[PDB]
Design a protein around this nucleic acid. Structure first.
Length: 49
DNA sequence: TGCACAGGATGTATATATCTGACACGTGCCTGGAGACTAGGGAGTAATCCCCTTGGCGGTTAAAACGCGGGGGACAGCGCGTACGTGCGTTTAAGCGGTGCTAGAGCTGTCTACGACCAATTGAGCGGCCTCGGCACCGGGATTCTCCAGGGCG
């Protein structure tokens, strides 16, 4: 769906996903596996990183 | 002539009468001791409600805890000299005995403002409420600010 929004319309935008702490990496690895053309960040190191 | 003595001519602690100071005892007028009436302030109870707990699993984070390098600052050793410690003689001035005063300190009537005590009104101040503009927190970016490596210089 997120990849369909890029081809169908011109809307990209910053998105947000809320994932449990265990599956946090599976969405990044899944974003490199599936649909490489997206720019994805992650969240670690609350006080500093 | 050189010498010991008997008595006067001065000291000196010794014993006696004498001068303050403080403890001890005998009063009578402003205190306490006590008796009765009023009453409102204190002891006692009936809900109450309201925030404050009970007990312990896990997941995760921010804060607490440990560990080593070493850099600089606490700290011991030691020499110097001038700044007070110590000891004299010389002076200015307080302690103290005594004096003449006064002007302010100190106890007592008058009344008179004038504040203590008590009804009537209310309005300005307190419980309740519900908003929004100032406030909380952080990005963007410029600015300063300290840390480290030559090198030109000793």
């Amino acid at each position: 769906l997120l990849a369909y929004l890029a081809c169908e319309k011109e809307n990209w935008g910053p998105h947000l996903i809320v994932v449990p702490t265990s599956v946090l990496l599976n969405w990044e690895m899944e974003f490199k596996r599936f649909a490489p053309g997206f720019k994805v960040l992650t969240y670690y190191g609350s006080p500093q990183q």
